Amino acid sequence: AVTIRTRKVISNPLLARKQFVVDVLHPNRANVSKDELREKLAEVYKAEKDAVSVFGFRTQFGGGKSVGFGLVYNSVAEAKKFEPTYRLVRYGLAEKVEKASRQQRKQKKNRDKKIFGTGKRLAKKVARRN
């Protein structure tokens, strides 16, 4: 079986959550996925799955145990409010934003920098000149 334990529990009403250290013992098993943990933690603390964040898990040398950090928000809304965007995308609470590589973005920024105004007039002018 797999046993989950929480320690160093600190209530943080300032961020409206509870922070703590997760210790999971998983004999005869590789390790536990974050979603599985978030499930167990959700029933343990009587909160929604979406209000549970878990991260920074390291399995001890030789296996059988892992240690990480866990946050349990008092609500889903406050969780979406505070919780990091990348972790929201990890849990599916937020959608990944599609953006170009910094090289193309910076090039485009400079290209716009050479242009003054909307530029529609330059377009129609070069159109009539051609």
């Binding site: 079986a1 797999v2 046993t3 989950i4 334990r5 929480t6 703590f20």
Partner: peptide
């Protein structure tokens, strides 16, 4: 103090 749970 924390809480304990076991599954599977």
């Amino acid at each position: 103090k924390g809480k304990n749970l076991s599954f599977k």
